[PDB]
Design a protein around this ligand. Sequence first.
Ligand SMILES: C[C@@H]1O[C@H](OP(=O)(O)OP(=O)(O)OC[C@H]2O[C@@H](n3cnc4c(=O)[nH]c(N)nc43)[C@H](O)[C@@H]2O)[C@@H](O)[C@H](O)[C@@H]1O
Ligand SMILES: C[C@@H]1O[C@H](OP(=O)(O)OP(=O)(O)OC[C@H]2O[C@@H](n3cnc4c(=O)[nH]c(N)nc43)[C@H](O)[C@@H]2O)[C@@H](O)[C@H](O)[C@@H]1O
Lengths: 629, 629
Amino acid sequence: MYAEAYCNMGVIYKNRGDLEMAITCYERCLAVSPNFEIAKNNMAIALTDLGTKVKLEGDVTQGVAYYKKALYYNWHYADAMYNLGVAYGEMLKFDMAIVFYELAFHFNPHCAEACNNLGVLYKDRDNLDKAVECYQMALSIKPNFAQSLNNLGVVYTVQGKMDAAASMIEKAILANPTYAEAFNNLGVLYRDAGNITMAIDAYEECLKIDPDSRNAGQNRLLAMNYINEGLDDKLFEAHRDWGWRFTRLHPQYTSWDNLKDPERPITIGYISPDFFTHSVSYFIEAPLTHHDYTKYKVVVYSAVVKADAKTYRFRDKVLKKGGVWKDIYGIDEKKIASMVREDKIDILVELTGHTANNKLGTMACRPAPVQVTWIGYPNTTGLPTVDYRITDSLADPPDTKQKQVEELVRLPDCFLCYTPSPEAGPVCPTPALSNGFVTFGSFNNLAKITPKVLQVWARILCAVPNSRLVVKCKPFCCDSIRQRFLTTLEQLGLESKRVDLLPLILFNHDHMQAYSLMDISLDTFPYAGTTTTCESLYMGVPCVTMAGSVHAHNVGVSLLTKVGLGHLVAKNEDEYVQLSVDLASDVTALSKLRMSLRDLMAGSPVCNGPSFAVGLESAYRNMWKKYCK
Amino acid sequence: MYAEAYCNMGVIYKNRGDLEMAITCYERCLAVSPNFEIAKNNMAIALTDLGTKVKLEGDVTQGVAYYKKALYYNWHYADAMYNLGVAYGEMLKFDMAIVFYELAFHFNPHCAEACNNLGVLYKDRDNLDKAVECYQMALSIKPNFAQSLNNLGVVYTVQGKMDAAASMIEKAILANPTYAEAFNNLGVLYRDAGNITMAIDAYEECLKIDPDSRNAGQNRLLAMNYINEGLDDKLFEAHRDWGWRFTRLHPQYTSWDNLKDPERPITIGYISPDFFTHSVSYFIEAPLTHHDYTKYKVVVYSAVVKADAKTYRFRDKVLKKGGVWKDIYGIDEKKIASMVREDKIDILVELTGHTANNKLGTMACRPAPVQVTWIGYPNTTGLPTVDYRITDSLADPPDTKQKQVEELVRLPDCFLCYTPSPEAGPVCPTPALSNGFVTFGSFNNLAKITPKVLQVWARILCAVPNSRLVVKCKPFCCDSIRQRFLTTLEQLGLESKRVDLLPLILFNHDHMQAYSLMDISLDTFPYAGTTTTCESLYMGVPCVTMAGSVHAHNVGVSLLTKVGLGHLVAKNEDEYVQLSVDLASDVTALSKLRMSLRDLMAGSPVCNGPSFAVGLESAYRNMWKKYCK
Ligand SMILES: C[C@@H]1O[C@H](OP(=O)(O)OP(=O)(O)OC[C@H]2O[C@@H](n3cnc4c(=O)[nH]c(N)nc43)[C@H](O)[C@@H]2O)[C@@H](O)[C@H](O)[C@@H]1O
Ligand SMILES: C[C@@H]1O[C@H](OP(=O)(O)OP(=O)(O)OC[C@H]2O[C@@H](n3cnc4c(=O)[nH]c(N)nc43)[C@H](O)[C@@H]2O)[C@@H](O)[C@H](O)[C@@H]1O
């Protein structure tokens, strides 16, 4: 009857914190008065609070049901929509989440958190402008929001605007000191900016704040890998510490069910998070199309954030050839291990290493008898659980001084196999004849460029008169970086008129054809590029690589030796200079060499598919035979 | 590249009607330009059209998925929300439907259909005011909408405002001639208004428009049941035609799996759509609480639109005593039959008949070996599939001339068992002493009142000087009905100062105690009331019923004979007059009779639970024994 007393008691209980008594009084009051607007709104508030409390325990479905009931009681309640969107993001239902966050923002403009999360979701789908404007609106509502600032820094780092990203990241750091993701992202930006010391200092601070930060430590090892000259071994100790901590942090499986018979078809699962237009994809294009599917079964574990045309064609080839394609995006590592075990897989090959969106969590438990890393992260994995790694004799000489935590297998010919792009197109003749001077070109990452490389390149330019230099890098999208690089080059005694810094090219065939203007390709050291060397050799421009005592330093040496140009490798910097001078001496030899290298690489073992496939299958058979005995 | 050509081609295909080519061009254009607002909106339009086309085929889930994708493309598209709400209403997910219809209305105020459907949904949950205002808004947008007018007429008919409902129903009929639900509802209102001839004419027109209208025909038979004097038999022929058409319209099951052993516990399933505060519920309160659950298992099939406290207590008693409670609201009859068969039920008892929200669709197939009607619709069911019906010897004398399509079983004592309300309260003494005159009272439905009853009541009033008359009926909520009734009474020679027409009482105990002002209760004929007689006898006021040749006419006779007041029954109208005069002759006898009748009914077989339960269980055992042999 008297619903006023019931609602007053319910309000008192809610303020006191008793949800059951309050919800009972609220229920009875609404039964007495079905159209009590204030009572209905308070009922919605109480149900939202109860749903949040339940979601604290972990019952997602019950919280969602309570939220839906509250929304039914009050359709235009914003916090309910926000909670629904958060839950839908948790359950990986992205479209419903987008809709609900947008509705929450429309109803309540003052919900900056919803806008920030919407920007996050849009950025996860490579909608850069939408994320930028979402974060800008978040700043418009709450200028002092740390998460929005950090994610805007992420987006600007991806876009290449390093100065603004650095400014905003520093603003976030000074806003919140106990916030490590800002340190990690500052250091990521520093690494992509071409300087390493402050990047290492940054992740060191980050690890001090967060001892158990996986991303921070992993990228810290990656950053140290850049400046490894092969003289010190503290990097090995850091890798060992990372591996031991990671192993002690996660459980492992010691049970196996695979048959002990060494004579049976092998299930090979290629697990990789980057099957889109990535360097790795190129080198995986041929083997998948070249395996004996009947003799060896093939499965794919793709964690790609966004599938592309290459992903679709790979899926078509796998399914047509008798394979299984699976998507593992947005799944916890434990579920990944469980599904891997339940798939009766024999061997697994990971192609990520300590890189973006890696899946070392799978290796945390060793779900399969054999796990091997083959391409990504040329340096040692550092995990004791990881058993073996794939390499050759050239990049890894038997007398190497590079200690490895895991055993190595030397492939007969090489462990690289490049695949031409379908629309690569013809190669234009040597432009030296048109312009009358040599134009050295480098299409490597700025992070691989070091002061030593700059000095060597300056010596190269000064050695031969009338020499041009062209460099293509993403960080050459900002004027400040360009000015700093030009000033650094001039400090060594090089004019700025002979330097051409170019930005990225969105269209792949344009990037492929951009090699037409280059004459001689020069590789950076110590962390020498791998895909760039093959890309250059395919277009006919000669490539020069310096040797070294590290596997990554010798990748280019191995590639050049295999393709048939082993005479184009210099052991020391001085020999590099003399080789470059000899190359620049004559133009006709360079021209006809450019003409021949196309067919030379076509007929080389590098481009041979069936032979490499047979060698790799024999390697797998030997691996399984060793496991059986 | 050129997305303009792709979008133009897609528009051309959509106009031409080619959905596949249009969706392909739309897909490629959005891939080229991820942020083409016009292209995105047209994509949403095309997806909505495709979803509607798919839902035409019948694939509800695929249409819902397409609608959700379209909404993701365009969050503020109203038609998508409308379609989502329609689908959610189809899948019986009511709360989500309410939310989505409300959102669609908020985005697009010009969607009168969404408002109409929202009003329908709210009315389905007894939210009368919300439905009224929804339909009023629909008229505010589209005054010429037939469905909104008809449903507003429904609501006003339920509320008791018959004049406005009739006006709006006539408006709907003249708006749309080929629209039978309007005829059915006009006739329903006429039936509830107390007049039958035009109601029968109305459903006759309705059946002419729609030969296979189940509701129209069923309620047509119900209406004829009101004016049945036991002289004509055309009603039996109409029932036979209805039964034959219904049987030929639906399939039947001829397979049985129940054991042939006559000695085993019997599973009895009480199927009824009205387990809320309804007359039937009262008479079912005792048997369920009085069965031998161990010897006979009990299950309940409730199709109640809205559960109440009585429903909750019945569920508690069933579950506590060892029974199963099931809700069958919003389920197709085929699924009902399938679940009934899968429940291993032995016998089923239906308590609806040709009444509101009946479930004769279940009887269409005879899912159980034994189906019996016991309470609802005292007249014959008319379905040949229905095997047997329950009655006694008093209301159904062995020498009856009322032919029945189904065999009858005569219970030993009676087939009625009333249950007192827990809060009935004490009975006040006879008010005749306070006021000095007799006050006849009638608490029956207006539809049961006929001109013959009015003439008889006028004769009763004129016979004894200083007599008051009080009548309680729902249609006495409108002034026009009251004036018409008073004019009709005055035309027979009765003053209006001795007539008191009262409306309904919302609170049950108030209705129970309203009998305190009554002195003698008078029953209508031929369709005599059943629950009202027991309700009156429980409060101590004597009840008078005229005999007849019909079962419904003799229900009151049987009740009065069983309770012990068989001397208070008159065979003819004249004997009714003399009995009433004799009752009114003395006041002291009436007073002490009022005092005694409480205990008299308490000790009568009518209120005896265990004895009736034993008799009913013996009846069931005999039924199963007959089935076995
Ligand atoms: C397999 C891995 O390869 C890694 O090489 P890594 O440094 O990324 O050498 P990157 O040249 O930076 O790889 C980026 C890839 O993107 C493409 N790409 C390069 N420039 C452009 C451009 O300007 N526009 C567009 N649209 N695409 C471009 C090209 O296929 C190149 O291989 C090694 O670091 C690892 O050790 C390992 O060998
Ligand atoms: C079991 C069935 O009973 C049927 O009796 P039927 O006409 O509905 O006789 P009614 O009196 O109309 O039934 C309506 C029920 O609602 C309650 N009720 C009556 N008046 C009021 C009121 O003023 N206010 C409120 N809140 N409740 C009221 C009371 O329990 C009454 O039995 C027969 O027609 C069938 O043949 C069959 O016997």
